[PDB]
Amino acid sequence: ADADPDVLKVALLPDENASELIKRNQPLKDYLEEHLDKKVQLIVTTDYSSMIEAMRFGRIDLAYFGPLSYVMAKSKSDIEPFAAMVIDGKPTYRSVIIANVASGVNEYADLKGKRMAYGDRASTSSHLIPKTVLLETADLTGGQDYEQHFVGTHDAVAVNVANGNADAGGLSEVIFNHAAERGLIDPSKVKVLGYSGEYPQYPWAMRSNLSPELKTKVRDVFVGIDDPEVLRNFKAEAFAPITDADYDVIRNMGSLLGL
């Protein structure tokens, strides 16, 4: 393994259409090349498990993980978290639970016997969080009291609810809120049922066998970002420093999934 590679392989959680993700992250790629003196190669894997496996086998250097996929990768490989974005004045985010207007689902209790869409099994806000909300508020258990279907991206959750393939679904609040704008769905076909509480934001992480000098530089460059052109694509105000213990809440909640 190379401690100080000339090219940095930088993976992005596949929570949306890969072209959308490459587009959104272009200004950050340009900023990193300038301030790190490295070439940057952006990667989007086919699913969450393939990004976790790429990290374990040393095939990527930096990764933008979700909270649950981060704690899963950290259990399998030697990695460290270093930054997360501050969006809307907070270092946290929420899941939204949505329903198709034609399904007969008017509240959480009405999901008994119906079809729920989740994203990836390793998703925080399109699986773990909404599943926990349905259990704690309505005493509903996935696969036992309702059908669960895993459709991949958060984009796919919104599409499958809106077109009638699912009756309800759970996903990231920010991703849902821009789905009509991007032309993914007709917003008249869906309604919001409710929201989760606030959970720690997606962490940036790197393989811990990079050199100490390179790891310090990566952390300093990200936390120092105040360029409006980089921040605007994310609707962010800053990149904040983080530690592994910030994700213990997710570890504890993950006991319900057998982690």
Author numbering: 2 to 260
Q: Can I see the authors' text?
A:
Here we elucidate the molecular basis of high-affinity phosphite and hypophosphite acquisition by determining the ligand-binding affinity and structure of the PBPs of phosphite and hypophosphite ABC transporters from environmental microorganisms. We over-produced and purified PBPs of three putative phosphite transporters; PtxB from the globally important marine diazotroph Trichodesmium erythraeum IMS101 (Te_PtxB), PhnD from the oceanic picocyanobacteria Prochlorococcus marinus MIT9301 (Pm_PhnD)35 and PtxB from the soil bacterium Pseudomonas stutzeri WM88 (Ps_PtxB), as well as a PBP from a putative hypophosphite transporter, HtxB, also from P. stutzeri WM88 (HtxB)18. The structures reveal that ligand specificity, measured here by thermophoresis, arises from a combination of steric considerations and the interaction between a ligand P-H hydrogen atom and an aromatic π system in the binding pocket. The structures of two distinct types of phosphite-binding protein and a hypophosphite-binding protein reveal that a P-H…π interaction ensures high-affinity binding of specific ligands, representing a universal mechanism in these PBPs for recognising ligands with a P-H bond.
We also obtained structures of phosphite and MPn complexed Ps_PtxB and determined the associated ligand affinities; both the structures and binding data were similar to the other phosphite-binding proteins discussed previously. Analysis of the conformational change between the open and closed, phosphite-bound structure of Ps_PtxB using DynDom42 revealed that domain closure is induced by a ~60° rotation around an axis that lies between the two lobes. This is facilitated by flexible loops that form the hinge region between the lobes (residues A85-T93 and Y200-Q202), as well as residues from the extreme end of the C-terminal helix (G255-L258). Superposition of the individual lobes of Ps_PtxB in the open and closed conformations shows that lobe 2 (residues 96–196, 0.35 Å RMSD cα) adopts a very similar structure, with the conserved STS-H motif (S124, T125, S126 and H155) spatially conserved in both conformations. The positions of Y94, which hydrogen bonds to one of the phosphite oxygen atoms in the closed structure, and D16, which hydrogen bonds to and stabilises the capping tyrosine in the closed structure, move ~7 Å and ~4.5 Å (cα-cα), respectively, on ligand binding. Y94 resides on the hinge region, the conformation of which alters substantially during domain closure, whilst D16 sits on a flexible loop that latches over the binding pocket in the closed conformation. In addition, the B-factors of the core residues in lobe 2 are much lower in the closed, ligand bound, conformation compared to those in the open structure, implying lower overall flexibility when phosphite is bound to the protein.
